[PDB]
Design a protein around this ligand. Sequence first.
Ligand SMILES: Cc1cc2nc3c(=O)[nH]c(=O)nc-3n(C[C@H](O)[C@H](O)[C@H](O)COP(=O)(O)O)c2cc1C
Ligand SMILES: Cc1cc2nc3c(=O)[nH]c(=O)nc-3n(C[C@H](O)[C@H](O)[C@H](O)COP(=O)(O)O)c2cc1C
Ligand SMILES: NC(=O)N/N=C/c1ccc([N+](=O)[O-])o1
Ligand SMILES: NC(=O)N/N=C/c1ccc([N+](=O)[O-])o1
Lengths: 216, 217
Amino acid sequence: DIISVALKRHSTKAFDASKKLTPEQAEQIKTLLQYSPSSTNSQPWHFIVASTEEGKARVAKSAAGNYVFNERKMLDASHVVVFCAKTAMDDVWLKLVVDQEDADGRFATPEAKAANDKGRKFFADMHRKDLHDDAEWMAKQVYLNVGNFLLGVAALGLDAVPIEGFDAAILDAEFGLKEKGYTSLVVVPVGHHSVEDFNATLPKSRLPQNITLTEV
Amino acid sequence: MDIISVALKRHSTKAFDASKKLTPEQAEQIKTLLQYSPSSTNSQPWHFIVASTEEGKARVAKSAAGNYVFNERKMLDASHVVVFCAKTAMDDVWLKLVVDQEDADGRFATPEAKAANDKGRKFFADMHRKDLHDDAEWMAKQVYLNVGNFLLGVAALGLDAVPIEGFDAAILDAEFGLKEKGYTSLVVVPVGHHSVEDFNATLPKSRLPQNITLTEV
Ligand SMILES: Cc1cc2nc3c(=O)[nH]c(=O)nc-3n(C[C@H](O)[C@H](O)[C@H](O)COP(=O)(O)O)c2cc1C
Ligand SMILES: Cc1cc2nc3c(=O)[nH]c(=O)nc-3n(C[C@H](O)[C@H](O)[C@H](O)COP(=O)(O)O)c2cc1C
Ligand SMILES: NC(=O)N/N=C/c1ccc([N+](=O)[O-])o1
Ligand SMILES: NC(=O)N/N=C/c1ccc([N+](=O)[O-])o1
């Protein structure tokens, strides 16, 4: 079941470059990215899915300097997902989200739509006008998406590794993200592990629940 | 179902049936999901409060105050309610705890492997706690990743849930003495079975189209 998946998945340290996702799997990973929940359904994100050699090479430019030992993961995997967050929460995006919810038939009346918009703005304004942490708030939603994604891809029988060891300034510049209103946060190569993936057979290790978990 | 079915079917439950409890097996399963989430460097910079008694849930629900009152019943009515907390600072005792646990579990072939893993972990941790002074946000991001893993996992178990940011973290922290223990509350997730008042159970899901959010290269 899903608990078996959670207990058996791992962060892949080396990919077999001959092993590709099926077209079906490639569509399934896009669906996972799209259907993640987020605060107010704000979906404050953009994904770059690199599957060509040229595309993956562009992403791998970010595995520079002290991050060079992540480069092969980006090159050898089948599909490499760059998770990006918006850099500021703007009204046009808030309108885009509520209009999409309306198109999907979530509102019975104009009043219901207006109440949803008002509630979304309560949370958005708390972050972007009061706390001034909307960049962080949106980034947190993207990390939530990554968590959904890693479990989902494992459940599809695919290997992956989440990567923070990359140069986001290089990756942003490579895809012109800043000027488009986004910034790169996590890179996740997806594919099938190779024999060089020493982590595939190592035991999982987590802190005991008697440290991390209180029942009340 | 496959996992894509779960992703397409799950929803944020707006009202729970307080008579429908998790089985003992399910209660163990949700704790496993919390524990086994990945995180940057396996830093696991988190604490979970799992409230299953009516007394415990009532206390968590004290945080649904003021502008957050319309999340109160979700917290009272679900079988189990999980409070996801992050560490407020990444200290060296914790970094040692994590590498010592990895060693106990058998991840290192030699003392040199263990040292190299420790060195690599500190490379990342020090970038945040020393260069950028943003380790609190870095750790909070790992907690959000855990929440994403959790919501999909509990849905795949056939359980309803809702992630909640609409709560007063000052009240919740004080209620469980979190700050003085070195933690702060970020997300509350009631888990159980929806009630007849869950208007969201039958509404269509809505997401932005991929032509807006997704570029293939
Ligand atoms: C946000 C995030 C960033 C990570 N960055 C890297 C990375 O740059 N390179 C790498 O090899 N592993 C990376 N990892 C993998 C972690 O070390 C791994 O998740 C952790 O040790 C737990 O092991 P598991 O993923 O096999 O369960 C990262 C994980 C997360 C969650
Ligand atoms: C971090 C986070 C916090 C949220 N906070 C609340 C909340 O306080 N109350 C609530 O009813 N729903 C909350 N939601 C639910 C979102 O509105 C919901 O995830 C989004 O509309 C997408 O719908 P779905 O979860 O049904 O797919 C939150 C979701 C996330 C991810
Ligand atoms: N943040 C969200 O996604 N949605 N929040 C919904 C609600 C409903 C009641 C409250 N509340 O804060 O009382 O937040
Ligand atoms: N951040 C992590 O969890 N683990 N990182 C592992 C590695 C391995 C190589 C690199 N790197 O940055 O080149 O990071």
